[PDB]
Amino acid sequence: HHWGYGKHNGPEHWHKDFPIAKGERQSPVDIDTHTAKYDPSLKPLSVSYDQATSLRILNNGHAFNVEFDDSQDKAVLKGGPLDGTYRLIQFHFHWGSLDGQGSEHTVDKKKYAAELHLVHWNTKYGDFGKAVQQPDGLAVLGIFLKVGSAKPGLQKVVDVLDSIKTHGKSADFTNFDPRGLLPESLDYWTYPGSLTTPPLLECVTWIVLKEPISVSSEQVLKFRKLNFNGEGEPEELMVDNWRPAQPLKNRQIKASFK
Ligand code: NA
Ligand SMILES: [Zn+2]
């Protein structure tokens, strides 16, 4: 793809190829915690990941995705602001060149070191490619990472990064349990938004958890060793693969808690 995160092809250029970049329900956004409305009608999230089947990890030239088998209801998200059952298809992260930036959402303008996105699609639409064309097609769970103590459940991911260093590399990646990436509390903010990379489609109910998880400096350092480029091309380190906050426009952020 021509788009990327550099000076000449980065997010401030994306609108020329993807005019929806300047749409009414783009993501990410800044979550202003004092303007977010507590909504007592929001249910707890229901995360059922006990039967998750991970398959593969892949460097796609803009992040790395861990991909899951989504041919049956094995790892699903329900409840919260959702109607219906959303199946987990992949997760990936966005991170920075330094620990003070890297997240896409911000909370009262505070940036975190990285942000994990667990991407799920509405099973009523039959496949992911049909789901992205619907306003309620995707639900993405967003979790912030701060740098502090190591997260043991992330280490299996960081160990394999060496084997997918360049764009197009993939590796078998089975028996990874994504329950090891969740914080203790499932309290959340939610708003209607978009994919944060091209094609930027406005098909996402965002569910952003309040509680960050901690990872160690050494764990995030290993993300920063990946490359945007393919093998045998000039080295460009995969860092700062985040899109800046977009205008909220005519949207309300709701909170599941006070
Ligand atoms: Na992708
Ligand atoms: Zn993402």
How many Cα neighbours within 13 Å face the side chain of 217?
A: 2
Q: Which ranges of 25-143 does DSSP label H, i.e. alpha helix?
A: 128-131
- What is the 8-class DSSP label of residue 133? T
DSSP state of 73: S
Kindly tell me the sign of the dihedral angle through the C-alpha atoms of 146, 218, 168, 17.
positive
Q: Identify whether the C-beta of residue 63 lies closer than 8 Å to the C-beta of residue 51.
A: no
Distance 51 CA to ligand 2 centre (A): 23
CA distances 134 to 113, 124, 206, 253, Å, are 31, 11, 14, 20
Under 8 Å between Cβ of 29 and 193: yes
Residue whose token pair is 């000076």: 7
Coil, helix or strand at residue 199 = coil
Among 15, 62, 105, 120, which one carries the catalytic annotation? 62
Nearest ligand (C-alpha, residue 193): 2
146 CA to centre of own chain:
15
Is 105 within 8 Å of 142 (Cβ atoms)? yes
Q: What's the gap in Å between 35 CA and the centre of ligand 2?
A: 24
Alpha helices in the chain (DSSP H): 128-131, 155-160, 217-223
Task: Judge whether 62 counts as a catalytic residue.
Answer: yes
Q: Is 8 annotated as a binding residue?
A: no
Contact 45, 183 (CB under 8 A): no
Query: Does 35 appear as a known binding residue?
Result: no
DSSP 237: B
Q: Which residue has the tokens 């091209």?
A: 198
SS3 44: coil
Task: Determine contact, residues 207/78, Cβ cutoff 8 Å.
Answer: no
Task: Tell me the CA–centroid distance for residue 116 and ligand 2, in Å.
Answer: 7
- Report the alpha-carbon distance of residue 83 to residue 105 in Å, rounded: 24
The phi and psi torsions of 9 (rounded to 5 degrees) equal -140, 15
Domain residues for the domain of 179 are 1-258
Which CATH number belongs to the domain containing residue 72 in this structure?
3.10.200.10
C-alpha span between 180 and 173 (Å, rounded) = 15
Q: In whole angstroms, what is the distance from residue 131 CA to residue 138 CA?
A: 7
The domain total for the chain is 1
**Structure solved via:** X-ray
Contacts with 103 (C-beta within 8 Å, 6 or more apart), sequence order: 94, 111, 112, 113, 114, 115, 144, 145, 242
What are the distances in angstroms from CA 92 to CA 18, 24, 65, 67, 88?
A: 22, 25, 5, 9, 12
* Element spanning 191, H or E: strand 188-193
Strand 254-255 versus strand 204-209 pairing type = unpaired
d(CA 23, CA 194): 9
| CA–centroid distance, residue 117 to ligand 2 (Å) | 5
CA angle in degrees (0–180, nearest 5) for 130-136-141: 105
197 carries a ligand binding annotation? yes
Report the alpha-carbon distance of residue 130 to residue 205 in Å, rounded.
Answer: 16
End-to-end distance of the chain based on CA atoms, in angstroms?
A: 42
Q: Are 194 and 68 in contact (CB under 8 A)?
A: no
Tell me if 178 sits within 8 A of 213, measured CB to CB: no
171 C-alpha to ligand 1 centroid (Å): 16
- To the question of whether residue 33 is assigned a binding role by annotation, the answer is no
Among residues 173, 146, 191, the alpha carbon closest in space to that of 91 is found at: 173
13 is in an annotated binding site: no
**Nearest ligand, measured from the Cα of 242:** 2
